[PDB]
């Protein structure tokens, strides 16, 4: 049993017609202190999977190393390591899910919430969640922390059920994700303007976008707001 | 302090017919006041014409099912591909649950199938392994809403024959699969109305001598 | 729960209710609280359902192995002690199990009370569970060694009924057993709802209740 | 592997004997003779030191007679180092018993314990047995005065008079001849020394080649006293009995 | 369990032990014998936490019976009491101590003397002319202090014991369902069937 | 000396092969499987007339539906029987059913090769495991110290095995009754035994679906011996 | 730990270490067991090579395992103590867990199991001991007499002998002991036990030990004079 | 000679005799044949009986839905090694949700057998195995030797008189590899291959044992009247 120290906030994601999108800001918070401003919380595994992690950063870095070691180990005595016997999103997820549930069962959890986004061999979209309790679930949209409360409602307006996935393009999905990240910046006190976004498409492959910023923000209406009730000046 | 347990909501329902059995469950997965998934399968075909659902804390439920599915696999290896009977599966699951008597699987478990005489069978468990064969059982969040309805509409409790005035009971006529599925759908529609953790979808697994069949029905998403 | 068991001239009677609870919620209307360890051995159950089922079925495994090694059936005294020894291993670990081991062996009819503390008591009459006080009232005022099989079965039946009525966590149905030197004999499942009204009319008891 | 070099210390011969035990007994037969004689009013322990030197410090030396507790003593025949391992274990066992029951350990119980330790080395562990034979002289309130012997096999027996070590065949014959049941300590002292004087491989029996001890109720009133004889005291008893 | 008394007279030791056994709010048994014969001339009564009492007593009984067979000899009451004390002193610092208080009544055949030892669950041993455990002594010791002589007969010991039980029955809130009385003397152990 | 788990140049484990020689010195045990049941019979072979022959227990119950006969160093069988009984009852605990005869046999045979430098040597005893289950019906197995087990329609083990097996080769057919099998075991036992066969120096047993495993009384066997003598004198 | 396999099979299918353990039993002093109609008697030889022995304190050949069961032996004396101790511990362990004393058959089966375990365990040698275990089961008046040996096999006997020159005394028992009519009284049972030892013993003085065990935990050891009277009566009848 | 007392001793020419003696046990064992195409893989095994009253010893063991093997030599050792494979196949499924690659299964068997050839006290496995399977890279056939050597092959045979079947497969190589989408014809080629190793005895109904795995075919064993079709 521990407590989280340096933490990363929401990770949000969604499925679209040809793949999945995942995003997460670049902040490492130390309680209310916005301590670290250059933290990458999306970690690619090969060219078909991106693992997005929220929660304790020290445990994230540990998981980051487990995945790096997983790729190394898979290549051992494997002539098809970059082809048929390459790591799949489902393999990577189930590994993590096994680790998370074992650690919680020893009362020494990895204090994280993880979303594994990727595209399988057969072109199928993969999107599944796992956390410190070993709880797992899948949905057309997935989000951690504050993202669950504020991002999912916005992303579910685009893909409300399974049948909406083929009707959703990458431009629409990316737009929804970017808007959701802005909303989180407005309303989440442990979020940052700077974020990373990753797209895993079955045709165009893995696109990893760094140093993205929240833009087109509305603040002008603040000038008119005065006092807390009766004050006019 | 770290709490190793959680509550993923949901509700499950098993009914045994004369020559069939059903195991139903909603597809909604939740934490607190949030929805995780509107479609997260909860009832599984475990092989050998057996269906199972472990409802409560999803992580423990998935682990139990995963372990029992594994127990079935090793039963075939060790005993010459012999079919695991429903009574033998039930006893096996008791030992899986009690192995954690001091750190329990936080789930209400139900299995359904056919007994060795071909009749419909439902078995019910508590989180620590006590089990028994039953005709009717609802488990999970809205179990207390649904069970009385089943006592009334499946076992005809407190129902008497008109004219006699409480002297002669309603006779215990068997139910068809079509009649049972109606009671299942009305049970979940009623539970969806009055319970916030129940909704989104309903998945029913029907077991007969021919095999395992699935039926899906939408539920209210509020 | 309410369970009882008593020795008499023609063996031992065992009677239990069939309710199960989860707080105020009645989780089961018809659970079996007697285990048929062997043709001449019975075990009653009260407390944690899981504990009762696991440990008494483990006792049956161990009683069966006794027969294979020795070519002879285990005594009631030895069976009760094996169970009490199991309880002493998990001493203070939080088990909850109250049981009577009923049977017939070479010393005649046998009855032992065993609980989660490792307690092991020999006696002619016992009753366990949330409603044991109600059962004891009827048993103590009506029990004799000279009871007939018919009157004895009724006493155990009527004693559970008394508890089912008053105790909120006892009821459902009554399961009767009669243990002889040729083995135990099941004397049926008796719904308390129907039994209550029947006993009320025939006996004249429960005058305060309207029916 | 290692099997190649294993002597296998705990096996039977075709005749049903334990090789190492038999060879340990052969070792003990070359050790200095030790004699024990039990009388009605006490026990005598006499033992011969092996070919000593004039430069050996005798008054501080102890190779034969050891004290286990206030009531029990032993005479040693064999490897002294092996005997000290066992003696220290026996001393602990006596104290364990005293702590547990608040009574001095009965002689036989102590003897059985040491004999069981010896037995273990002949049946398991793959180690060589202890090349030691003990004569136990002790007293308790159940059986009174008692003599026992144990050997490397772990077998022990009770005696009125007994010898271990060298020339036991000759020594036992001499003891069997002159011993009587109504005998007293002062007579037993004389018998022990006379037997050693005839069986010894040395030219003459002297004080510097002997260790001597008595367990007497010759202590003030109902109690027992152990007397480990000093070099000068052994010299006096040799003159008294008429050997030197 | 509740009350266990002991008294050492001229030529015997008398142990009185309550018959009641209670679970929850119900008295399950009113004829329970809270004692074990350790050897032909040594009797041990016991009282403490449920289950632990019998388990401990039977464990002691087995060990003494093992000693008796091995040596073909009966241990003195003093030796047995010391063995029991050490087991309790060993127990008190264990993970889960045995919560048992005992009285050991024995007749020493060597010294031709009765002996009574009081030992509590901590391993606190005392040899006494009369003894008790728990609250029993609060009511009875004033009577025993007054009436006790060391030259008392067995019959006088029983009469003084009756007076102690009567006082307990008057001033104790709990109903302990009378006592089973046993006498330990040169001829062995016997039970007083009418008390 | 040499390893306990050493292979010979022919590709056999020395110790396993030597244990088979010990089994050849053992008393004869015969098993015959039929559609009405499986019969198990043994030669008791008392070393002296003062030895109470009824205490010779070379036929043993494992479960109600499984029996077992032994030949060789019979003291080694006790731990195997204990394991078999435990395995049988444990499976009943875990699965609320009878255990398959093959699965029981496999559990016993798993102990066989657990020796090295675990126990120090292989077992010096062979077992005839006979029983019934719902899946494969009446079955007879021969469990060796090699860890191998063969199913048999009929099998003889012990000192008169090859002579008895040749006799079982001719006599066995798929339509044998239980009574015919009983007499056939007695016949072949009488042929290979040194001393004259009677109810005191030979024991019968069987396993049927209805009555389960039963060891035959000396009075019951005596009648079957008398019935055998008369039918042999009939032609 | 020392794991060396000492008891192993030889090419001809023999475990020599177990067979050499039997040779140690052959060397041991003669022990005999005879059961009458309402009793069992255990006779034991004491070799007279050892005089100046203290017979009060010397370990007796017959050992009580419980109040109703006894054990005598032939072979290595030190080895026998280990079996006796284990047997005594198991006897109390059985009373403690099952609330009944051991049956004679159960106790025998345990001791035999220990002996067997030492024939296929690493780093240990077999017990060079054969035992005669006798007594009466609780609340039973039928006599019990069993024999065990290093290999671990056991069996029940109407009468049996073990140890040196056991071949001779067994020969005597086989012709003298009638099963249809066993020694009806204690006298007849003891007389037959003494007679059997007199075929082998040498002198009938302190060389013969007799222990009579009767039902309901009634065990007594005969003294020198009591035995000497049997020795006198036997030879006086023989002079004819 | 002096260097065959245990597995921990090289001979002067660098040979391990205990391993070679374990290899000898395989040659004494009954013949079994393995072969594959691009779609399916097939095992064919000649079962051996003790006598006419006895059953025919089973040769083929299932490891997973997509993998299994046939044995030749000490049957109990095959049970140990197959049990190990069952566990490894199962570990891959439960942890990684991944069917174990046949090549990786061979690597695991190699390493398990190797540990027994370098340490004192133990012994080499006395059995040879033919592993077939269908994974993400198609059909596979492996040959396991208890020296540790595992080899991926188009076809092979082990056991007594296995050289005859191995020569046949070496001729038929170009033909049977092309038998795609036709399980019965691939089995026919295996039955014809194992027939080249027969003398005196012929393939009967309770003598022959066949197993197959493929693209849309789980590992299944055929015995009894199920193989009468191929006799
Ligand atoms: C009285 C009815 C209530 O005290 C009786 O003691 C029964 C005994 C009993 C014995 C065997 C089988 C079933 C019941 N006890 C219970 O019903 C207990 C009471 C209890 C709740 N918590 C608790 C208790 C006792 C001691 C410590 C803590 N109830 C249970 O154990 C609950 C958890 N059991 C169930 O919910 C069961 C369900 C549902 C179910 C069961 C048990 C068995 C078979 C199918 C379904
Ligand atoms: Mg809502
Ligand atoms: Mg005190």
Q: Which residues contact H161 (CB under 8 A, 6 or more apart)?
A: H31, H197, H198, H199
Q: Is the CB of C18 under 6 A from ligand 1?
A: no
Residue A227 CA to residue A216 CA, distance in Å, equals 26
**d(CA E134, ligand 3 centre) in Å:** 9
What DSSP letter does each residue of G22-43 carry, written as one string?
HHHHHHSPPEEEEE-SS-EEEE
> Angle at the Cα of F152 (from F146 to F157), degrees rounded to 5?
60
Residue of C1, C19, C20 with the most ligand 1 atoms within 8 Å of its CB, for mutation: C20
Q: Do C68 and F61 touch (CB under 8 A)?
A: yes
What's the CATH code of the domain at B187? 3.60.20.10
Residues present in chain H in total: 231
Q: Are F98 and F92 in contact (CB under 8 A)?
A: yes
Give me the residue spans of the domains in chain D. Answer: 1-244
What domain count does chain E have? 1
**What phi and psi, each to the nearest 5 degrees, are found at residue C133?**
-65, -40
Instruction: Give the CATH number, domain containing residue C132.
Output: 3.60.20.10
CATH number of the CATH domain containing E18: 3.60.20.10
Q: Two tokens at B105?
A: 């699987």
SS3 of H219, please? strand
Range of the domain at E122: 1-195
Strand intervals (E) in A92-190 = 112-119, 125-131, 136-138, 141-143
Do residues H101 and A94 lie in contact, with contact meaning Cβ atoms separated by under 8 Å? no
Which of the 8 DSSP states describes residue H57? P
Distance, CA of A192 to CA of A37 (rounded, Å): 8
Domain containing B165 equals: 1-222
* Nearest ligand by distance to the CA of B199: 2
Q: Which residues pair with G204 in a beta bridge?
A: none
The alpha-carbon gap from D155 to the nearest alpha carbon of chain G, in Å, equals 5
Burial letters D167-202, b for 16+ CB under 10 A, else e: bbeebbebbeeebeeebebbbbbbbbbbbbbebbee
The subunits that touch chain A, with at least 3 C-beta pairs less than 8 Å apart, are B, H
Query: Determined by which method?
Result: X-ray
Q: Which residues share a beta bridge with G69? A: G135
Gap between the Cα atoms of B187 and B168, Å rounded: 27
C-alpha pair distances (Å), D51 with each of D48, D66, D209, D239? 9, 20, 8, 21
Coil, helix or strand for D12? strand
3-state secondary structure string, chain F?
CCCCCCECCCCCEHHHHHHHHHHHCCCCEEEEECCCCEEEEEECCCCCCCECHHHCCCEEEEECCEEEEEEECHHHHHHHHHHHHHHHHHHHHHHCCCCCHHHHHHHHHHHHCCECCCECCCCCEEEEEEEEECCCEEEEEEECCCCCEEEECEEEECCCHHHHHHHHHHHCCCCCCHHHHHHHHHHHHHHHCCCCCCCCCEEEEEEECCCEEEECCHHHHHHHHHHHHHHHHCC
Residue located via tokens 């010391």 = E82
Q: Which residues does chain G have within 8 Å of residue F75's beta carbon, measured at their own beta carbons?
A: 112, 116, 119, 151-153
Q: Between D15, D158, D162, which is nearest G57 by CB?
A: D158
User: In whole angstroms, what is the distance from residue D131 CA to residue F114 CA?
Assistant: 37
Separation CA A53–CA B10 (nearest Å): 27
Q: How far is A91 from chain H, CA to nearest CA, in Å?
A: 5
Q: Cα(F70)–Cα(F44) distance, rounded to whole angstroms?
A: 11
Contacts of E49 in chain C (CB under 8 A): 117
H111 touches chain A (CB under 8 A): no
Cβ–ligand 1 distance for C176 under 6 Å, the answer no
| Helix-helix angle A57-75:A89-105, to 10 degrees | 130
- Most D CBs within 10 A among E63, E64, E72, E79, hence the mutation to make, goes to E79
Q: Provide the CB-side half-sphere exposure for H104 (13 A, CA).
A: 21
The residue behind tokens 């998981």 is: A63
DSSP letter for H197, please: G
Residues in a beta bridge with E115: E106
Domains of chain A: 1-233 (3.60.20.10)
A87, two tokens: 């790591």
Answer whether C80 contacts ligand 1 (Cβ < 6 A).
no
Give, in order, the Cα–Cα distances in Å from F101 to each of F63, F98, F143.
Answer: 10, 9, 12
DSSP-derived secondary structure letter, B101: T
- Distance CA(A13)–CA(A147), nearest Å, equals 9
- In chain A the first and final C-alpha atoms are separated, in Å, by 53
* Residues of C identified as active-site: 1
| Cβ proximity of C98 and C47 under 8 Å | yes
Q: How far apart are CA E18 and CA E2, in angstroms?
A: 7
By the 10 Å C-beta count (0-12 exposed, 13-18 middle, 19+ buried), C166 is classed as middle
The conformational region for residue G202 under phi > 0 = left, psi -120 to 50 = alpha, else beta, is left
- Residue B132 CB less than 6 A away from ligand 1: yes
Best CATH choice for the domain D1-244 from the list 3.60.20.10, 2.40.128.120, 3.40.50.1580, 3.30.460.80: 3.60.20.10
**Spatial distance between the Cα atoms of B166 and C194, rounded to a whole number of angstroms:** 11
For C189, the token pair is 């499942």
Domain that residue G201 falls in: 1-240
> Which residues of D have a CB under 8 Å from any CB of F?
3
Measured CA to CA, the distance from residue C8 to residue A113 in angstroms comes to 65
DSSP D124: B
Please tell me the distance from the alpha carbon of residue D221 to that of residue D224, in angstroms, as a whole number: 9
How distant, in Å, are the alpha carbons of A9, A69, A96, A103, H7 from that of A53?
9, 17, 11, 17, 51
CATH for H1-231, options being 3.60.20.10, 3.30.470.20, 3.40.50.620, 3.40.50.261? 3.60.20.10
Rounded Cα distance, F50 and G156, in Å:
9
CA D79 remoteness from chain centre: 12
Please tell me whether residue D192 adopts helix, strand or coil conformation: helix
Q: What's the distance, Cα to Cα, between the start and end of chain B in Å?
A: 33
Name residues whose C-beta falls within 8 Å of residue F153's C-beta, 6 or more positions apart in sequence.
F32, F33, F140, F172, F174, H53, H54
The span from the CA of E98 to the CA of E82, in Å, is 17
Strand partners, B52: B44, B111
Nearest-atom number in ligand 1 for the CA of C45 is 10
Tell me the sheet residues that pair with E36.
E44
Contacts of D121 (CB under 8 A, 6+ apart): D9, D10, D127, D128, D129, D130, D152, D154
For residue C72, give Cα distances in angstroms to D147, F203, F206, G90.
49, 20, 19, 20
Nearest of E66, E77, E167 to residue E115 by alpha carbon? E77
Ligand 1 pocket member C20 (CB < 6 A): yes
Q: What is the CA radius of gyration of chain A?
A: 19
| Experimental structure resolution, Å | 2.6
CA-wise closest residue to D35 among D187, D175, D202, D234: D175
Q: Using CA atoms, how far apart are residues B78 and H6, in angstroms rounded to an integer?
A: 34
Domain ranges of chain H: 1-231
Domain at G6, CATH number: 3.60.20.10
Q: Do chains B and G touch (3 or more CB pairs under 8 A)?
A: no
Contact residues for D158 (Cβ-Cβ < 8 A; gap 6+): D146, D147, D148, G53, G54, G55, G56, G57, G58, G59
Number of domains observed in the structure of chain G? 1
Of E17, E16, E35, E9, nearest in space to E129 by CA? E9
Strand partners for A113: A54, A131
Range of the domain at C19: 1-211
Q: What is the position in ligand 1's atom list of the atom closest to the CA of B131?
A: 44
Distance CA H145, CA F62 (A): 38
List helix spans (H) across chain D. Answer: 19-28, 80-101, 107-123, 168-178, 185-199, 231-241
Classify residue A106 as exposed, middle or buried by CB count within 10 Å of its CB (0-12, 13-18, 19+): exposed
What residues in F contact D3, CB-CB < 8 Å? 1, 3, 117
Distance CA(E93)–CA(E121), nearest Å, equals: 11
Angle between helices D185-199 and D231-241 (to 10 degrees): 90
What is the spatial distance between Cα B54 and Cα B96, in angstroms, rounded to a whole number?
12
As a whole number of angstroms, the distance between CA F100 and CA G41 comes to: 48
For chain F, list the domains and their CATH numbers: 1-235 (3.60.20.10)
Q: Residue E63: phi, psi to the nearest 5?
A: -65, -40
Nearest Cα to Cα of residue B124 among B41, B27, B30, B16: B16
By alpha-carbon position, which residue is closest to atom 29 of ligand 1? C21
- Nearest-by-CA chain F residue for D6: F1
Structure tokens at F175: 């339509």
Q: Is C116 in the pocket of ligand 1 (CB under 6 A)?
A: no
Strands B211-218 and B201-208: antiparallel
Nearest to D114 by CA among D141, D149, D140, D144: D149
Are A129 and A89 in contact, with CB atoms under 8 Å apart?
A: no
What would the two tokens of residue B131 be? 């089990």
* Chain F hits for C71, Cβ within 8 Å: 61
Contact assignment for F96 to B88 by CB distance below 8 Å: yes
């Amino acid at each position: 049993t521990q407590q989280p120290i340096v933490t990363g906030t929401s990770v949000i994601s969604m499925k679209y017609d040809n793949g999945v999108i995942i995003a997460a800001d670049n902040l490492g918070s130390y309680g209310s202190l916005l301590r670290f401003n250059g933290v990458e919380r999306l970690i690619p595994v090969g060219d078909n999977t991106v693992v997005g992690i929220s929660g304790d950063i020290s445990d994230m870095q540990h998981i980051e190393r487990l995945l790096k070691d997983l790729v190394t180990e898979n290549a051992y005595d494997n002539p098809l390591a970059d082809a048929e016997e390459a790591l799949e999103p489902s393999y990577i997820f189930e590994y993590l899910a096994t680790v998370m549930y074992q650690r919680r069962s020893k009362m020494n959890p990895l204090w994280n919430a993880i979303i594994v986004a990727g595209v399988q061999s057969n072109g199928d979209q993969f999107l599944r969640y796992v956390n410190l309790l070993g709880v797992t679930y899948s949905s057309p949209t997935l989000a951690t922390g504050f993202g669950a409360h504020m991002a999912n409602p916005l992303l579910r307006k685009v893909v409300d059920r399974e049948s909406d996935i083929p009707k959703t393009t990458v431009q629409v999905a990316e737009e929804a994700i970017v808007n959701a990240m802005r909303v989180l910046y407005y309303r989440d006190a442990r979020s940052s303007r700077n974020f990373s976004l990753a797209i895993i498409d079955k045709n165009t492959g893995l696109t990893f976008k760094k140093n993205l910023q929240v833009e087109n923000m509305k603040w002008d209406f603040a000038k008119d707001i005065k006092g807390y009730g009766t004050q006019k000046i | 302090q770290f709490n190793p347990y959680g509550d993923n909501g949901g509700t499950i329902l098993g009914i045994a017919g004369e020559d069939f059995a059903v195991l139903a469950g909603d597809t909604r997965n939740i934490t607190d006041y949030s929805i995780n998934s509107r479609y997260e399968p909860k009832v599984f075909d475990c092989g050998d014409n057996i269906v199972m659902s472990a409802n409560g804390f999803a992580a423990d439920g998935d682990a139990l099912v995963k372990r029992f599915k594994n127990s079935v696999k090793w039963y075939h290896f060790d005993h010459n591909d012999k079919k695991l009977s429903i009574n033998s599966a039930a006893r096996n699951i008791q030992h899986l649950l009690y192995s954690r008597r001091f750190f329990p699987y936080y789930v209400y478990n139900i299995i359904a199938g056919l007994d060795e005489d071909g009749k419909g069978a439902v078995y019910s468990f508590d989180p620590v392994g006590s089990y028994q064969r039953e005709q009717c059982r609802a488990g999970g969040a809205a179990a207390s809403l649904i069970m009385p309805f089943l006592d009334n509409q499946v076992n005809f409790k407190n129902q008497y024959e008109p004219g006699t005035n409480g002297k002669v009971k309603k006779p215990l006529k068997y139910l068809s699969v079509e009649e049972v599925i109606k009671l299942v759908r009305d049970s979940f529609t009623s539970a969806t109305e009055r319970h916030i953790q129940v909704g989104d979808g309903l998945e029913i697994l029907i077991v007969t001598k021919d095999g395992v069949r699935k039926e899906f029905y939408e539920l209210k998403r509020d | 729960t309410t369970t009882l068991a008593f020795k008499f001239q023609h063996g031992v009677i065992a009677a239990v209710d069939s309710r199960a609870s989860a707080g105020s919620y009645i989780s089961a209307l018809r659970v079996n609280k007697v285990i048929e360890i062997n043709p001449y051995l019975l075990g009653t159950m009260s407390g944690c359902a899981a504990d009762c089922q696991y440990w008494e079925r483990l006792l049956a495994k161990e009683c069966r192995l006794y027969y294979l090694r020795n070519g002879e059936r285990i005594s009631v005294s030895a069976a009760s002690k094996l169970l009490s020894n199991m309880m002493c291993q998990y001493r203070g670990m939080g088990l909850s199990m109250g049981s009577m081991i009923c049977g017939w062996d070479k010393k005649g009819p046998g009855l032992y009370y065993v609980d989660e503390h490792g307690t092991r008591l020999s006696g002619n009459m016992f009753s366990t569970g949330s409603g044991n006080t109600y059962a004891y009232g009827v048993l103590d005022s009506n029990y004799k060694w000279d009871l007939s099989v018919e009157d004895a079965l009724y006493l155990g039946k009527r004693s559970i009924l008394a508890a089912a009525h008053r105790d909120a966590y006892s009821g459902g149905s009554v399961n009767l057993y009669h243990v002889t030197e040729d083995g135990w004999i099941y004397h049926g499942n008796h719904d308390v709802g129907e039994l209550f009204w029947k006993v009320k009319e025939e006996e004249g008891s429960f005058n305060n209740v309207i029916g | 592997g290692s099997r190649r070099y294993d002597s296998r210390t705990t096996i039977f011969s075709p005749e049903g004997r334990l090789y190492q035990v038999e060879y340990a007994l052969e070792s003990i037969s070359h050790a200095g003779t030790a004699i024990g004689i039990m009388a009605s009013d006490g026990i005598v322990l006499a033992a011969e030191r092996k070919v000593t030197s004039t430069l050996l410090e005798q008054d501080t030396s102890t190779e034969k007679l050891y004290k286990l507790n206030d009531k029990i003593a032993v005479a040693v025949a064999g490897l002294t180092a092996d005997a000290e391992i066992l003696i220290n274990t026996a001393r602990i066992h006596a104290q364990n018993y005293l702590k547990t029951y608040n009574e001095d350990i009965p002689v036989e119980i102590l003897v059985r314990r040491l004999s069981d330790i010896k037995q273990g080395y002949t049946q398991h562990g793959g180690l060589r047995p202890f090349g030691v034979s003990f004569i136990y002289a002790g007293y308790d309130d159940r059986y009174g005065y008692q003599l026992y012997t144990s050997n490397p096999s772990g077998n022990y027996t009770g005696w009125k008079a007994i010898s271990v070590g060298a020339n036991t065949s000759a020594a036992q014959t001499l003891l069997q001849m002159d011993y009587k049941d109504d005998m007293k300590v002062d007579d037993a002292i004389e018998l022990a020394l006379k037997t050693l004087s005839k069986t010894t491989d040395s030219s003459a029996l002297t004080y510097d080649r002997l260790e001597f001890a008595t367990i007497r109720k010759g202590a003030n009133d109902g109690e027992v006293y152990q007397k480990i004889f000093k070099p000068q005291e052994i010299k006096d008893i040799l003159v008294k009995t008429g050997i030197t | 369990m509740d009350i266990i008394l002991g008294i050492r007279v001229q030529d015997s030791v008398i142990l009185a032990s309550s018959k009641a056994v209670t679970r929850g709010i119900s008295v399950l048994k009113d004829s329970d014998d809270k004692t074990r014969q350790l050897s032909p001339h040594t009797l041990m009564s016991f009282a403490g936490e449920a289950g632990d009492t019998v388990q401990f007593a039977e464990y002691i009984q087995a060990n003494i019976q093992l000693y008796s067979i091995r040596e073909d000899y009966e241990l003195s009451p003093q030796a047995v009491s010391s063995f029991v004390r050490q087991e309790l002193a060993k127990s008190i610092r264990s993970r889960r101590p045995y919560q048992v208080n005992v009285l050991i009544g024995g007749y020493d055949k060597k010294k031709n003397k009765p002996e009574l030892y009081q030992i509590d669950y901590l391993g606190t041993k005392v040899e006494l002319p009369y003894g008790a455990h728990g609250y029993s002594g609060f009511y009875t010791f004033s009577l025993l202090d007054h009436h006790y002589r060391p030259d008392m007969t067995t019959e006088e010991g029983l009469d003084l014991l009756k007076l102690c039980v009567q006082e307990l029955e008057k001033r104790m809130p709990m109903d302990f369902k009378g006592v089973i009385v046993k006498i330990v003397d040169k001829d062995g152990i016997r039970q007083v069937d009418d008390f | 000396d040499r390893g306990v788990s050493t292979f010979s140049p022919e590709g056999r484990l020395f110790q396993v092969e030597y244990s088979l020689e010990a089994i050849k010195l053992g008393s004869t045990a015969i098993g015959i499987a039929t559609k009405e049941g499986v019969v198990l019979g043994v030669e008791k072979r008392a070393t002296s007339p003062l030895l109470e022959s009824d205490s010779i227990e070379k036929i043993v119950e494992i479960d109600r539906h499984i029996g077992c006969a032994m030949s060789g160093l019979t003291a080694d069988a006790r731990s195997m029987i204990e394991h078999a009984r435990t395995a049988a009852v444990t499976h009943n605990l875990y699965y609320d059913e009878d255990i398959n005869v093959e699965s029981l046999t496999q559990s016993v045979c798993d102990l066989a090769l657990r020796f090295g430098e675990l126990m120090s040597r292989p077992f010096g005893v062979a077992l005839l495991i006979a029983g019934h289950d719902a899946d494969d019906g009446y079955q007879l197995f021969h469990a060796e110290p090699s860890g191998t087990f063969y199913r048999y329609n009929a099998k003889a083990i012990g000192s008169g095995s090859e002579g008895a097996q040749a006799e079982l080769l001719n006599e066995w057919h798929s339509s044998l009754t239980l009574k015919e099998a009983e007499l056939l075991v007695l016949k072949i036992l009488k042929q290979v035994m040194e001393e004259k066969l009677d109810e005191n120096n030979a024991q019968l047993s069987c396993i049927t679906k209805q009555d389960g495993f039963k060891i035959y009384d000396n009075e019951k066997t005596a009648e079957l011996i008398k019935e055998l003598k008369e039918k042999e004198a009939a032609e | 730990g020392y794991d060396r396999a000492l008891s192993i099979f030889s090419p001809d299918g023999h475990i020599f270490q177990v067979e050499y353990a039997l040779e140690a039993v052959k060397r041991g002093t003669c022990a005999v067991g005879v059961k009458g109609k309402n009793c069992v008697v255990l006779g034991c030889e004491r070799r007279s090579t050892l005089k100046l022995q203290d017979t009060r304190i010397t370990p007796s050949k017959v050992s009580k395992i419980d109040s109703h069961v006894v054990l005598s032996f032939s072979g290595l004396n030190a080895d026998s103590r280990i079996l006796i101790e284990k047997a005594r511990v198991e006897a109390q362990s059985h009373r403690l867990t099952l609330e009944d004393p051991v049956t004679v058959e159960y106790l025998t089966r345990y001791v035999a199991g220990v002996q067997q375990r030492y024939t296929q365990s690493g780093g240990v040698r077999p017990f060079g001991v054969s035992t005669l275990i006798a007594g009466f089961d609780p609340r039973d008046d039928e006599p019990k007499l069993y024999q065990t040996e290093p290999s671990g096999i056991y069996s029940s006997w109407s009468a049996q002998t073990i140890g040196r020159n056991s071949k001779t005394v067994r020969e005597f028992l086989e012709k003298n002991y009638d099963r249809k009519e066993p020694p009806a009284t204690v006298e007849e049972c003891v007389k037959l036990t003494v007679r059997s030892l007199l075929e082998v013993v040498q002198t009938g003085a302190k060389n013969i030990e007799i222990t009579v065990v009767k039902p309901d935990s009634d065990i007594v050891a005969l003294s020198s004079e009591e035995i000497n009277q049997y020795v006198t009566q036997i030879e006086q009848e023989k002079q004819e | 000679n002096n260097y065959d007392g245990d597995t921990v001793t090289f001979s002067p020419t660098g040979r391990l005799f205990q391993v070679e003696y374990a290899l000898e046990a395989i040659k004494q064992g009954s013949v079994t044949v393995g072969l594959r195409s691009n779609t399916h893989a097939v095992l064919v095994a000649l079962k051996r009986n003790a006598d006419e009253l006895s059953s025919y010893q089973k040769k083929i063991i299932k490891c997973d839905e997509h993998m299994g093997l046939s044995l030749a030599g000490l049957a109990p050792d095959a049970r140990v090694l197959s049990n190990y494979l069952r566990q490894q196949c199962n570990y891959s499924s439960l942890v990684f949700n991944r069917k174990l690659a046949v090549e990786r299964a061979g690597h695991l068997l190699c390493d398990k057998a190797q540990k027994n050839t370098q340490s004192y006290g133990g012994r080499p496995y006395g059995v040879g195995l033919l592993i077939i399977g269908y994974d993400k890279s198609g059909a596979h056939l492996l040959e396991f030797q208890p020296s540790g050597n595992v080899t991926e092959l188009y076809g092979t045979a082990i056991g007594a008189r296995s050289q005859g079947a191995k020569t046949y497969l070496e001729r038929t190589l170009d033909t049977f590899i092309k038998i795609d989408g036709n399980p019965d014809e691939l089995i026919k080629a295996g039955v014809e291959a194992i027939s080249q190793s027969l003398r005196d005895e012929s393939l009967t109904v309770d003598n022959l044992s066949i197993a197959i795995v493929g693209k849309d075919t789980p590992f299944t064993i055929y015995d009894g009247e199920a193989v009468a079709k191929y006799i």
